[PDB]
Paper text:
We purified 70S ribosomes from E. faecalis strain OG1RF and analysed the complement of ribosomal proteins in the purified 70S sample by mass-spectrometry. Structure determination by cryo-EM using multi-body refinement produced molecular maps that reached 2.8 Å for the 50S subunit, 3.0 Å for the 30S body domain, and 3.2 Å for the 30S head domain by gold-standard Fourier shell correlation. These maps were used to generate models for the 30S head and body domain and the 50S subunit. The final model of the E. faecalis ribosome includes 97.6% and 94% of 16S and 23S rRNA nucleotides. Ribosomal proteins that are less tightly bound and those in the L1 and L7/L12 stalks were not included in the model. The overall structure is similar to other bacterial ribosomes, as expected, and ribosome functional centres are well conserved. Motions described by eigenvector 1 of multi-body refinement include an 11-degree rotation of the 30S body with respect to the 50S subunit, and a 7.5-degree rotation of the 30S head with respect to the 30S body. Motions described by eigenvector 2 include a stationary 30S body and 23-degree rotation of the 30S head with respect to the 30S body. Motions described by eigenvector 3 include 3-degree rotations of the 30S body with respect to the 50S subunit, and 22-degree rotations of the 30S head with respect to the 30S body. Inspection of the amplitudes along eigenvector 1 suggests that the motions along this eigenvector are likely discrete, whereas motions along eigenvectors 2 and 3 are likely to be continuous.
Author numbering:
A (entry chain C): 2 to 276
B (entry chain U): 2 to 90
C (entry chain 4): 1 to 44
RNA sequence: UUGAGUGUUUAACCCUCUAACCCGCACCACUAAUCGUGGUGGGAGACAGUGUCAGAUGGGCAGUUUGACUGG
RNA sequence: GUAUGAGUAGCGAAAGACAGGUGAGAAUCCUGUCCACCGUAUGACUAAGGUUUCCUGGGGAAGGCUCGUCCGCCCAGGGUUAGUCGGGACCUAAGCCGAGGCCGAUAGGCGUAGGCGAUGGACAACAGGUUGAUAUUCCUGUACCAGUUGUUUGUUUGAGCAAUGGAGGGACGCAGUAGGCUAAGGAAUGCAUGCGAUUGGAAGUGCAUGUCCAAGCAAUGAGUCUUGAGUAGAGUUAAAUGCUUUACUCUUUAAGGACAAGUUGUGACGGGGAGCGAAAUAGUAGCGAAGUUCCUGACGUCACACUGCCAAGAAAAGCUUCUAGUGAGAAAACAACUGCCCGUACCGUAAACCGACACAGGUAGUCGAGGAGAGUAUCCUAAGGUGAGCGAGCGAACUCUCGUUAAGGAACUCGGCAAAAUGACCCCGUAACUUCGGGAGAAGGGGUGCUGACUUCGGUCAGCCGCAGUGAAUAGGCCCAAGCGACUGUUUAUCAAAAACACAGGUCUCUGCAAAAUCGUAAGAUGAAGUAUAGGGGCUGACGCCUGCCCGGUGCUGGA
């Protein structure tokens, strides 16, 4: 649930947080962590290519199985854990050979289930199958877009897609955001929707907590000088003395579309709905 | 090369006191070992050696006649004996 | 009241020394222009 | 660069194929390797990318111009 | 090159005085005595940095804001000692370099294998003595680590050794209290000496001084952490008796296993120790008493051990196992031998570093005592350091820094600017308003020293003295109203700290992943080891109530 703080300081008045009640341990598996660095938005060359990033808390990377390739061997669920790198929770899983792995935690996963990962698997939450073998109207997450590469699509906290129909060598899916699309019928996905979903309702509360997450502050274009922004300059507060407010590099900012007009995937997109 | 290694003895007031505990001071070559000096001394006098000690000495700024520059570098080794003696004067 | 020059031995050799001047093509332009003038010290 | 077949209309157009071209897909060898090169599948395909020419748009950026008389 | 201003400004925070030495010459150098200053530092140790400034014997032309017999200055000689400390012959982070490679008018840009690179990991010695100048380096005593020589059975493997392979391990955040030990501190038992010449004191209750010790080895140990076994199977690229794991069965205050500050012996018939003190130039050589009890007690160490939280907290080698394995026969006794290169002086809250200066500035880390105190605050002091590189007189105007002031009390000035006033602890009390937390130390008042008695305990009663009892130093003035910005934060190094910027929250829009966006000719990158509850761009700016009318014009989107 969402936890509400009492207003004991001015920096506390309207903050909320997670209860962390689906999490069952706080000590990760040692053989599945690697280091990370916090690039802070800088390049190959040492230059800022993305503004407003840098300098929070240190993190170790957990390796996830986005492929789901170990078939005809059940895996038991041992823990539901905290990941610093994503917004979903994560599950430690014991295969019977004794391989260990991490997995994205779907909605309603209990410690103790036994998941299966092939074409003859059942339709239960957690199970992963090729899209050919999934009926019409099942809620789905963690979708491959190329055979054998790993799920890419429905991965963040509380998201889901749905199966609409089949044809020759393609399956129709309605994704999160409402776009309709085609995906190869030999790709995989796992049954369920992603888990921790109150995540959306958290109120950060003060300027220090979003500094703990690795975000640096943002200055508005219109309190700059005319050599920094197209919006800078003028005596006093000023309006947008232009048509169409723009980015620091020109490029209009309300309603102007920026995807590639000769995209090699415009064959597969039915019914653009939201971007 | 065992005969270019030892250069000469040091004869100062701090080194006369060492000759009374069976210790001898020599300016040795730069690029010489503790072990190489030990071999050379055992070869050139027929003694038995316990324990060479070794130091480096920095050059000194000097200034004679509106022309200044440094003296040489130096290497000083102090050789201790078990029981025998060398007579230098 | 902290002034600009704060001495350090490693930095002076790593930014201005002989090997740093030898590793670029413009460092060797510097070394040749100093040898052509008669400098007694061509590289820090 | 760039190939092949059918059909629909007055040449153009909608298509289908697979061998070029592409792959920030998988497995294999050089091999200590998430680079690279070869090999086999899969995907995509005469499209895309790249060269020469042409029409738009373009203070994002550049070089300049913005007269004289005059009880100042 | 030389004048004028002119023998004028200044001589860079601070306590000295006298006696005697030396000498051509002394306020300024030496020796003494008393006085004064710092003491969470102006004391002790060290990493940078400097680079001979360090010690001894001479000197006085220049440097030293005066002087100089003196010196961090000048001349001559001399000083730095390591198997164990810090670095290399060990490991890796960021970043850097990169055989082949990929890109590109040239020059060149990037990057794979593999390397370099500590500010981190790993890693065997202590206590005392000694010089004019070095000491975990020399010496004394007693150790430890890695090797070498000698004297004390089928390389199949049941001897031994064993991987560039399989595994285990190393291996990690912030806050908060509690416990245990030791360092450090205080007051009285033991010592040793000696009795006041200004009124008084031979002392169970009187003055001054002192009141202990290592590494290693052996014994144990305040305590802390962790369940353990059996069978049937997966697996671990070949093999494993090693490791991971699924299912079942017994087991749980238990048993087993692991780690542990310290303490007591030995080391030690040794060392140090108040003082005593020579044969000569020596407080010198040398000779030495005593080692107690009680109170207080560390964020030092056990130890990031335990608890709680969210923002979720390096890598690699040494190390330890298991086999695969070219593969006579090496285990452990004693003895005696071997063990390389670089640094090591001295300054280091400073006259030796950064500031052109012997400059009122700046400089990482450890140690940092007593009384009264919560304290590293405050005042006075201990161990230690210092009297600060121009002086002697006088005691005018004026300028600066300080102390006091009759009567009045903001009449001053742009403005109570600047001063004065409040200030500690204990007790009583305390409004409107409010987001229910606050407002609040609201406001306003009272107590405080010393002796005796009782003290249930914490205090209360009786008495005494002064103008005054937190008798010094240190420590909120408050109240009633209105504008701006919710708030903590940030800003014009060097005339502007704010009503400006940011902010949590709102809303519009772009983006289906080789994402949009940005660096770049490209290769390659960030975004992101992310995937629409995600990432970019514009405006507004907690929270409460709300956010009207217009699509003609201009942009944007869709059309045909």
């Amino acid at each position: 649930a969402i936890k509400k703080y009492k207003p004991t300081t001015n920096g506390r008045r309207n903050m909320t947080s997670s209860d962390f009640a689906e999490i069952t341990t706080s000590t990760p598996e040692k053989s599945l962590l690697q280091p990370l660095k916090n690039n802070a938005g800088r390049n190959n060359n040492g230059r800022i290519t993305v503004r407003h990033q840098g300098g929070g808390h240190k993190r170790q990377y957990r390796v996830i199985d986005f492929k789901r390739n170990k078939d005809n061997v059940a895996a038991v669920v041992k823990t539901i854990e905290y990941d610093p790198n994503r917004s979903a929770n994560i599950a430690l899983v014991h295969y019977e050979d004794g391989v260990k792995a991490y997995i994205l935690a779907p909605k309603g996963l209990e410690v103790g289930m036994r998941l299966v990962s092939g074409p003859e698997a059942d339709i239960k939450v957690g199970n992963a199958l090729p899209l050919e073998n999934i009926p019409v109207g099942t809620v789905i997450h963690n979708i491959e877009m190329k055979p054998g590469k790993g799920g890419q699509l429905i991965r963040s906290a509380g998201t889901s897609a749905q199966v609409l129909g089949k044809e020759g060598k393609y399956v129709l899916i309605r994704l999160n955001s409402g776009e309709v699309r085609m995906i190869l019928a030999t790709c995989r996905a796992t049954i369920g929707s992603v888990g921790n979903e109150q995540h959306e309702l958290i109120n950060i509360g003060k300027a220090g907590r979003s500094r703990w997450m690795r975000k640096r502050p943002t200055v508005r274009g219109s309190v700059m000088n005319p050599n920094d922004h197209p919006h800078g300059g003028g005596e006093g507060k000023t309006p947008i003395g232009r048509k169409a407010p723009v980015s620091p590099w020109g490029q209009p900012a309300i309603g102007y579309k920026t995807r590639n007009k000769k995209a090699k995937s415009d064959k597969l997109i039915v019914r653009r709905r939201t971007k | 090369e065992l005969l270019d290694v030892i250069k000469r003895p040091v004869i100062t007031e701090k080194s006369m006191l060492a000759m009374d505990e069976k210790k001898y001071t020599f300016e040795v070559d730069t690029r010489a070992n503790k072990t190489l000096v030990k071999q050379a001394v055992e070869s050139a006098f027929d003694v038995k050696v316990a324990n060479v000690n070794i130091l480096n000495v920095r050059p000194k700024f000097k200034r004679m006649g509106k022309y200044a520059g440094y003296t040489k570098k130096r290497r000083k080794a102090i050789v201790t004996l078990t029981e025998d003696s060398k007579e230098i004067q | 009241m902290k002034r600009t020059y704060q001495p350090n031995k490693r930095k002076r050799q790593k930014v201005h020394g002989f090997r740093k001047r030898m590793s670029t093509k413009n460092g060797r332009r510097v070394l040749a222009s100093r040898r052509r003038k008669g400098r007694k010290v061509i590289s820090a």
